[PDB]
Amino acid sequence: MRQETRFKFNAYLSVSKKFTVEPSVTQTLMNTMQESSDFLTRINIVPV
Amino acid sequence: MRQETRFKFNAYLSVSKKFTVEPSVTQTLMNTMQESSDFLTRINIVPVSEMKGEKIGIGVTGSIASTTDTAGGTERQPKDFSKLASNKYECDQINFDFYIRYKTLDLWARYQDFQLRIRNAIIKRQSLDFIMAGFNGVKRAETSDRSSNPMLQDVAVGWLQKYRNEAPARVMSKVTDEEGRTTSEVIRVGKGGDYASLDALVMDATNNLIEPWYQEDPDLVVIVGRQLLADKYFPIVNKEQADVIISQKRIGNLPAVRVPYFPADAMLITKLENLSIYYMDDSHRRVIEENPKLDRVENYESMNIDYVVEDYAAGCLVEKIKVGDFS
Amino acid sequence: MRQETRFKFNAYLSVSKKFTVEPSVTQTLMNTMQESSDFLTRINIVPVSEMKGEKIGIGVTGSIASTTDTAGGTERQPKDFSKLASNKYECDQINFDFYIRYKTLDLWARYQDFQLRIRNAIIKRQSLDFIMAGFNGVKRAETSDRSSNPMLQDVAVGWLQKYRNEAPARVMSKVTSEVIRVGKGGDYASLDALVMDATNNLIEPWYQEDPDLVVIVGRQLLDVIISQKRIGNLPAVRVPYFPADAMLITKLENLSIYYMDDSHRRVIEENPKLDRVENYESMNIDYVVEDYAAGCLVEKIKVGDFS
Amino acid sequence: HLSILVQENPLANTTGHQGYVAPEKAVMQQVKSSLEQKIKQMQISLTGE
Amino acid sequence: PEYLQPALAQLEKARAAHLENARLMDETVTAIERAEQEKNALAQADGNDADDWRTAFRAAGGVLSDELKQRHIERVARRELVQEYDNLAVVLNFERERLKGACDSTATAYRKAHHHLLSLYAEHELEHALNETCEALVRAMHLSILVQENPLANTTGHQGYVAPEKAVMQQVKSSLEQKIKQMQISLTGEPVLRLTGLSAATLPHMDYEVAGTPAQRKVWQDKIDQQGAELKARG
Amino acid sequence: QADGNDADDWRTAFRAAGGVLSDELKQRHIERVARRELVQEYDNLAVVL
Incomplete structure (x- = not known):
């Protein structure tokens, strides 16, 4: 019920491969590493 | 060490009593609730941005000094600056939830200035509730019922239970012997008991149990309930002969404070900024x-809190106190 | 007779609290630390540009006037002005070495007012340590491990050790029983007889009638707080760290x-x-009692009851 | 005197540091009360020459 | 007696307990002293025998037969056996520690019981001596009050005209306190000479006092339990 | 196990007789330490086996 999720859901009342919370540096490095190998491409890596 | 933290430290190189981060709504509500009562003023309500991790240290002091022959011999091994006994806090949620009936709501809304009164009333009802739940409350159990636990003993683990099951050997619950593991279940304090009076009790307790560092401190308080304090100061007034001795209320050469709903058969000696x-x-x-x-208007509110004593070696509590004669 | 002192004294032929040789950085830090606590305000901290010299005499008095038969044949004997015993001293080093861990560093770094809180914490933590090592310590060992010596007893020499070591008088620990007694069955009254005997027998007379004499004893047997009721007509105080079973009568500027x-x-x-960041700091200090007069101490007491 | 010698024992004072009345004054107040009660409840007869 | 008689044998029981405790203490002390004084002489004799064997073996060159064989193995046997001889000291001290703890415990218990008995006796005696006798003083004080109440008695004016009751009470208090201060206690009485006197008379009163207050006792007991659970790994 | 039992018994019997001993507790102790030295190869044989 945080003041952001209610606003984001209320606007709904009126794309599934990458998530990209915010473009930080650790995320860029992780994307590079997962792009390097091939098995990491089919798998799902996400930040939290 | 982290990016922003490394920058702030490099900048360090080249009111200070409370902690703030950014102006938000929960912080504002907590600050208001603190300013409401008085006991919450002399305590640390800290906002944290993590569900589990390390606690910060306040009022921790450890002797850090030595001398070493660096000239042709051993090296200098620095001692830790903030290393406590055990430190792992786990925040959990508690929620309040109530309702007003239509009749009472109408009766109140009839007169002006009702919203402000309602707000102040609920804030006052909430702060005292924080206190009452904190000092009591052995363990937390989901689906807490208020049938057989009227003293609010099931919301969350309290400071007393923290002392009980996190750092033993700092409590006193029985008089024992090398052969009698329970020579006395309860600590009798009277003319014939195991002590002379509460003064000697708190005295030898603050002598033996707590560490020598905090032992010599300009700030210590003996948090005790109301029944025991009045039981001690009543036979003084019930005599025939000076009334200032009721204003300061010192016991065992230590200032004494009283908080509501504190358990009557226990008392905790510690500095009031440690918990x-x-x-x-x-x-x-x-x-x-x-x-x-x-036909009722209801509301629900939820907040994630956790009680914590910072350094367990700061204070100690005695439990199961009984005053009598014991001839 | 250095070319500066003659010039400074010759100009004299034609204010007592702070000294301030020159505004350096170590002096500023020392002033900050002494301003932090309260007990350091009444005490005297001074700098010196060399070691093993003379004690700057502050708070020393006496009787200088006399009379002589100048015509009979004798001559005026100029008694000393700064007459003290063992005016020598020294200086030693002491170092604080401590590390902060990364996680805790992040925690402190999250909130506001970070550097100020860190500075105040470290200043307080070392300022308390100065005192806690002052009234204790009997050696100058080279290891000084804080395991087998909980309180600081191996860093430096303390006031209660300088008294016990240099002047074997001015301290009573034996009446002849070994440890003195106090009580109805002891060798004295509760406290007035003992403190009176001390202030009449050991400390010199022309320091007795002083408006600043103070008895100092720990929190037992009772910042810094003063007890209103004087024990030996002298106000009593308590300093944070102190061996409870002993006490000393002296001024507050003599240290x-x-x-x-x-x-x-x-x-x-x-x-x-x-996973840590270490910090080492080293300074050079020495404790000193100004005058061995205006001060005595009793060491081994035991209040109670006897036959 | 025996009562005083008993009361002087450390494990005697029920009251702590506050109101720790001296045993002498305590026993004196006790005897004074127990004596004045008798002197008040009694009367003076007249069978004396 | 006949009212504190059942409350009296506990004194004798605690007395016997403390006596047995002190006896065990001195027995342990003399035992460790004997063990140490014997260990010293045994070590010295071993050293002397070792020196003699070494020089005699150096005399006979690098060859030996029919001798210096049983002697050397006997010497190394003694050297191996003195290990536990020296080891026994630590278990003896650990055994003495809890003994001294129980000694201080029984000492303080006996002291408390004695004080309680003495207090009960003194209270009963004062009550029975005030209620029964000292009645002529009451009528004397009543007559004195009746005299002092008359208006032609108070030499003090309107200021400080203290009531005659307070005056006569202060008078009797002073005249009684002077007597109670100048006098002393004599031991010419069966019950007071039988068991009473000073606090106690034995060796352990305050010297050790390791337990003393119950809190310090608890700390010491916890430390002793830790030490014992540690030592249980060895002999 | 037998060695441990014998060791316990010897230790308590020696504690009983005080800090003095003669004509006994001499052959027993050296026999015990001999067995303690001999069990070494007894345990060692496992690795070669």
Whole structure:
């Protein structure tokens, strides 16, 4: 019920491969590493 | 060490009593609740931005000095600056939830200035509730019922239970012997008991149990309930012969404070800035409802908190106190 | 007779609280630390540009006037002005070395007012340590491990050790029973007889009638707080750290610490081999009692009851 | 005197540091009360020459 | 007696307990002293025998037969056996520790019981001596009050005209306190000479006092339990 | 196990007789330490086996 999720859901009342919370540096490095190998491409890596 | 932290430290190289981060809603509500009562003023309500991790240190002091022959010999091994006994806090949620009937709501709304009165009333009802739940409350159990636990003994683990099951050998619950593991279940304090009076009790307790560092401190308080304090100061007034001795209320050469709903058969000696409560930054979720099935307007509020004593070696508590004669 | 003192004294032929040789950085830090606590305000801390010299006499009095038969044949004998016993002293080094861990560093870094809180914490933590080592310590060992010596007893020599070591008088620990007694069955009254015997027998007379004489004893047998009721007509105080079973009668300006100027080395290291950031600091200090007069102490007492 | 010698024992004072009345004054107040009660409840007869 | 008689044998029981405790204490002390004084002489004799064997073996060159064989193995046997001889000291001290703890415990218990009995006796005696006798003083004080109440008695004016009751009470208090201060206690009485006197008379009163207050006792007991659970790994 | 039992018994019997001993507790102790030295290869044989 945080003041952001209610606003984001209320606007709904009126794309599934990458998530990209915010473009930080650790995320860029992780994307590079997962792009390097091939098995990491089919798998799902996400930040939290 | 982290990016922003490394920058701040490099900048370090080249009111200070409370902690703030950013102006938000939960922090504002907590600050208001603190300013409401008086006991919450002399305590640390800290906002934290993590569900589990390390606690910060306040009022911790450790002797850090030595001398070493660096000239042709051993090296200099620095001692830790903030290393406590055990430190792992786990914040959890508690929620309040109430309702007003239509009749009472109408009666109140009839007169002006009712919203402000309601707000102040609920804030006052909430702060004292924080206190009452904190000092009591052995363990937390989901689906807490208020049938057989009227003293609010099931919300969350309290400071007393923290001392009980986190750092033993700092409590006193029985008089024992090398052969009698329980020579006395209860600590009798009277003319014939195991002591002379509460003064000697708190005296040898603050002598033996707590560490020598905090032992010599300009700030120590003996938190005790109301029944025991009045039981001690009553036979003084009930005599025939000076009334200032009721204003300061010192016992065992230590100032004494009293908090509501404190258990009557125990007392805790410690400095009043050592224990604290942590709360998540943004978890104060509040919703309204106007269902007519029971013609009542209800509301729910939830907040994630956790009580914590910072350094367990600061104070100690004695439990199961009984005053009598014991001829 | 250096070319500066003759010029400064010759100009005299034609204010007592702070000294301030020159505004350096170690002096500023020392002033800050002494301003932090309260007990350091009443005490005297001074700098000195050399070691093993003379004690700057502050708070010393006496009787200088006399009379002589100048015509009979004798002559006026100029009694000394700064007459003291063992005016020598020294200076030693003491270092604080401590590390902060990364996680806790992040925690402190999250909130506001970070550097100020860190500075105040470290200043307080070392300022308390100065005192706690002052009234204790009997050696100058080279290891000084804080395991087998909980309170600081191996860093430096303390006032209660300088008294016990230099002047074997001015301290009573044996009446002849070994340890003195106090009580109805002891060798004295409760406390007035003992404190009166002390202030009449050991401390010199022309320091007795002083408006600043103070008895100092720990929190037992009772910042700094003063007891309103004087025990021996003298106000009683309690200092934070003190061996409870002893006490000393003296002024509050007779004690002092001398910190060698321009000796303060602070370095910080960051060794990621462990997950910590270390900080070393080294200074040069020595404790000193100004005058061995105006001060005595009783060491081994035991209040109670006897036959 | 025996009562005083008993009361002087450390494990005697029920009251702590506050109101720790001296045993002498305590026993004196006790005897004074127990004597004045008798002197008040009694009367003076007249069978004396 | 006949009212504190059942409350009296506990004194004798605690007395016997403390006596047995002190006896065990001195027995342990003399035992460790004997063990140490014997260990010293045994070590010295071993050293002397070792020196003699070494020089005799150096005399006979690098060859030996029919001798210096049983002697050397006997010497190394003694050297191996002195290990536990020296080891026994630590278990003896650990055994003495809890003994001294129980000694202080029984000492303080006996002291408390004695004080309680003495207090009960003194209270009963004062009550029975005030209620029964000392009645002529009451009528004397009544007559004195009746005299002092007359208006032609108070030499003090309107200021400080203290009531005659307070005056006669202060008078009797002073005249009684002077007597109670100048006098002393004599031991010419069966019950007071039988068991009473000073606090106690034995060796352990305050010297050790390791337990003393119950809190310090608890700390010491916890430390002793830790030490014992540690030592249980060895002999 | 037998060695441990014998060791316990010897230790308590020696504690009983005080800090003095003669004509006994001499062959027993050296026999015990001999067995303690001999069990070494007894345990060692496992690795070669």
